[PDB]
Each structure stands twice: as C-alpha cells, then as structure tokens.
Amino acid sequence: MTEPIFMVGARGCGKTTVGRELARALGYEFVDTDIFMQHTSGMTVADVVAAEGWPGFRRRESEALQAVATPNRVVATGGGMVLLEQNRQFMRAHGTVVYLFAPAEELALRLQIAEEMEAVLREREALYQDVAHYVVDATQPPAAIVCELMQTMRLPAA
C-alpha cells in the first residue's frame, strides 16, 4: 500500500540517507522534516531555539510533520520527533513507522559524543520502539537496509 513511511531514530542512525534510498527504490517522494524546516523558514534549529526555545522548535516540528505527511512519500524525521506523544500517534495513524536502530557506540562513531548518544538512547530508545511498527539494524549499508525493509514490510519496488 502507499501510506507514508516515517523513518525514526537518533542522530547518526542514517535516517536521511536510508529514507532517500528507500524512497528511490519504491518510487516515492522523499522529505526530511528538519531540512524542510530549514528551507521553508530560513532558520536553523539553533535560530529557532534562540528565539522561541525548545518548546517553539517542537511546535514547528509537529507542524512540519503534519504539513509533509502524504501518501507515496518517505518522511525522515529528526531525532526528537518521537518526544511528543501527538507526534507518535500521528505517525502510526497516518502511515507506517520504521526505527533505524544502532547502539550508542555506533551512533557516536558515525561522524560525517559516545556518552551523549548513550544518554539520548536512555531518554528515547523506548520511544523509538513504542512508535515503530518495524525495527531494522541501522549499521548495515543503506542499500542492505532498503532491501531488508522492502522484504519485511512487503513493499514492491517501483
């Protein structure tokens, strides 16, 4: 089916890259909520936070989620998208959610911090699992994740 596919996970799990390659494989559109915010508002997350705080950024992020969710589209989401319950509900309702899981060690390794990702996971691991319909090993190359997702999720290639 063509419900929107939400990619969730912590910074460093490869969301944008896997999202983009999955979208290409399925013939879907691709949008990253963080990138959408930047290029529609002109403001970075630091700008938004400096002007309106973390609460203001989280509201914008919720709004972005709602604005870009549509069928036949893969949506890569920022690390903190899973913090608000309404965001978690929105994603499981509107579509199907995939958590790109990696231990903190590997998240920290990816740097195109080890203990800061450990702490991110203590706060958010359970939230990623709560919202995810499907959990995949994000330490594989993107192409291998793409392949595994199409099989597990029973999605045809474009």
Ligand SMILES: [Mg+2]
């Ligand atoms: Mg759904």
Ligand SMILES: [Mg+2]
């Ligand atoms: Mg789950």
